[PDB]
Structure formats: structure tokens, C-alpha cells
Design a binder for these strands. Structure first.
Length: 351
RNA sequence: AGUU
């Protein structure tokens, strides 16, 4: 009994949806806002610089913090993501880590192992973005350490979006928690659903297309990481012509109802979630011809690194345009997601 | 498949 039967929304999610929206945020939003900046992070950054510099003498070293804590959707149990730039690699793109990058990460491992200030949790060199997971013992904060600047770049984009249009931030906190209660996080990450929220609000004219923030003319040049444009015009929404909403409980509830209803009925077979273009009905069959000329040139030289479109669910990263962030979602995982969306939208209704 |  599979495709003809709806996957039942888990009880742990149902209780939270049917419970008042207020109790969702009463603690979670103020906590998430406070975790954007705490002094603990300066201790981590300084300790990490002190730890690793002797391992890379005569090379510049800068640490960049990113991820959910930094954008404003974290909680006390969230990891802190850290990009360690040794030797000015910020503007270098590696879809999969180079051997040189792996050798650098390998060399970093023994420092965390040897240092009493850090507990090594895992060393993941075979991931697309290899990482060292380690606990910073003085603060107790778990850190994911990588050698790839792109997550930092999209964090700064999210931070601008969230600060300009706080509704986005409230919605992301809600759907992050919904994913956890639905036990969907193995298939759909917090970052993936953040891009889905962004795209949904773009369709409502509440957020700009990312492409529109990256016009290349006399006033505005690109910051490039490989072929990707990672900066954006930090224009006020007043200049952009976009209204800025106060997120209230009824406002949030109404947008979340429409969010879940929209992704319950989205045609994942023919369309992709596309915060770069930020318009309705962006066709899987067309997207590769809609990107900037650097994309086509990049795939010409990296033919196995074009966006993976032959997948049940396509959500394109707005900066790293060759990345379908949901490429690992299975047909049954997508069916589960859409069913959960459908049931959540129903429970958020008030006829 | 593992950060975002």
C-alpha cells in the first residue's frame, strides 16, 4: 500500500501544528536572534586560529562563521559552521574537494585530536564538502569545519534577506522545527527548505530574485568564487520597491498555510524551486539555458558538474547554480514531503 | 549521499 495512500503526518508534528503559533516562537525567535552574535564565537574563532596557524606557517589564515546560528534560525543545540581559509582560497571553487584540499583537511585532523580544547567527533573526507566535526570544549559548541567558502557566501545572502524581511526568518524557524518533527531531515535539510521559503516569498513579491541583485554593469561588478557570483547589491527594500511586513502570529500563520499548500501541489516533475530567477514555473527543461554565461563555460570544462536535474526534487542553490540541494531526495521521500505538506496546510486552515 |  504505497502511492495510493497518503503518508500520515507524524503525531509529533501534528501536535505542534495544531498548537498555537505563539508557543512556537515564544522562546525560539528571541533565542535564534540572540545566537546570531555571542562572545563564545569569538573564543572559538581565536582558539581555532591559535590551534591551526603553526600547522600552516607563512600562510594567511582567516576563519569565517556561517550557518543557521549566524543567519538567525539556530537554537542552543545548533552547530556552528566554520570556513577556514588557509592561503587565500576564498575565491576558489571546488565542487568536489581537490586532492590538495583533502591533504589540508587531513593535516588539520591531528591538531584537533592533539588539543585538549577540542574533541574530534568525526572526520568526513568523502563528502562533496569534506568536513571535520569537532566539539569546542570550553564553550561546548559543536563545530563543522570546512575549506569551502560557498556556505559563508550564502549565509551572508540569507542574513540580508532575513534582516530585510523578518517574516522569512520566522517562517524558516517554523519549517526547520517542522522538518525535525516530521523526521525529514535526512532527506530535506534546513538549508533546502530555507531556499524553498525564499522562493515562495519571491513569488509573492516580498523578496527579490537573486539574479536581480546581481546585475553586472558600470556600478556593480561580481565577486566571483570560481564561476559563481557570490555578492549582491545590498539595496534597501525601499529602493527595490518591496514592502516590508511586520511578522505577527496571524500573518505568519497565513503565509505558512500558503507555503505548505503551494509545495503540496508543486509539479516537481517539470519545475524547480529557483530563488535565482525568483519567478513562477521555472522549467527543469529550460533552466540551464537561463543562467549566466560562466555557468555554460564552467560545465564545458567540468562536464560531470552540471546541475543534477534527473532527480525527483530540484531545488537550485541561488549562488552555486550547479547544485540541486535536494538531489538526494527519493521518490518516496518526496511523496512523504508532499503528503506532510498537504496535511499541514489542512491543519493550518480556519474556514 | 554527509557543510551550507
Amino acid at each position: 500500500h504505497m502511492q495510493h495512500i497518503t503518508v500520515r503526518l507524524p503525531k509529533k508534528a501534528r501536535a505542534m501544528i495544531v498548537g498555537e503559533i505563539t508557543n512556537v516562537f515564544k522562546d525560539k525567535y528571541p533565542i535564534a536572534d540572540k545566537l546570531k552574535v555571542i562572545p563564545e564565537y569569538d573564543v572559538i574563532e581565536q582558539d581555532l586560529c591559535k590551534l591551526l596557524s603553526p600547522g600552516f606557517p607563512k600562510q594567511p589564515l582567516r576563519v569565517y562563521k556561517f550557518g543557521s546560528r549566524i543567519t538567525g534560525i539556530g537554537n542552543r543545540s545548533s552547530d556552528l559552521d566554520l570556513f577556514v581559509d588557509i592561503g587565500n582560497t576564498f575565491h576558489t571553487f571546488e565542487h568536489r574537494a581537490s586532492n590538495a584540499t583533502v591533504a589540508k583537511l587531513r593535516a588539520m585532523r591531528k591538531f584537533f585530536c592533539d588539543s585538549e580544547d577540542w574533541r574530534l567527533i568525526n572526520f568526513i573526507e568523502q563528502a562533496r564538502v569534506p568536513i571535520i566535526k569537532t566539539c569546542h570544549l570550553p564553550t561546548g559548541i559543536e563545530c563543522d569545519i570546512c575549506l569551502n567558502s560557498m556556505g559563508f557566501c550564502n549565509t551572508n545572502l540569507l542574513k540580508y534577506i532575513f534582516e530585510s524581511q523578518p517574516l522569512t526568518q520566522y517562517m524558516c524557524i517554523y519549517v526547520k522545527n517542522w522538518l525535525e518533527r516530521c523526521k525529514l531531515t535526512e532527506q530535506i535539510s534546513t538549508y533546502s527548505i530555507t531556499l524553498m521559503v525564499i522562493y515562495f516569498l519571491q513569488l509573492q513579491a516580498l523578496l527579490p530574485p537573486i539574479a536581480m541583485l546581481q546585475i553586472e554593469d558600470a556600478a556593480n561588478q561580481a565577486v566571483l568564487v570560481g564561476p559563481w557570483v557570490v555578492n549582491f547589491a545590498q539595496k534597501s527594500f525601499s529602493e527595490l520597491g518591496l514592502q516590508q511586513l511586520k511578522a505577527t502570529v496571524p500573518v505568519i500563520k497565513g503565509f505558512l498555510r500558503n507555503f505548505f499548500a503551494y509545495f503540496a501541489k508543486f509539479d516537481y516533475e517539470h519545475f524547480l524551486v529557483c530563488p535565482y530567477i525568483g519567478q513562477a514555473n521555472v522549467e527543469i527543461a529550460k533552466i540551464e539555458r537561463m543562467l549566466h554565461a560562466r555557468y555554460s563555460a564552467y560545465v564545458s570544462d567540468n562536464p560531470e558538474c552540471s546541475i543534477q536535474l534527473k532527480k525527483p526534487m530540484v531545488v537550485q542553490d541561488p549562488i552555486q547554480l550547479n547544485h540541486n540541494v535536494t538531489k538526494a531526495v527519493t521518490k518516496y521521500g518526496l511523496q512523504t514531503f508532499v503528503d506532510y505538506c498537504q496535511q499541514t496546510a489542512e491543519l493550518l486552515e480556519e474556514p
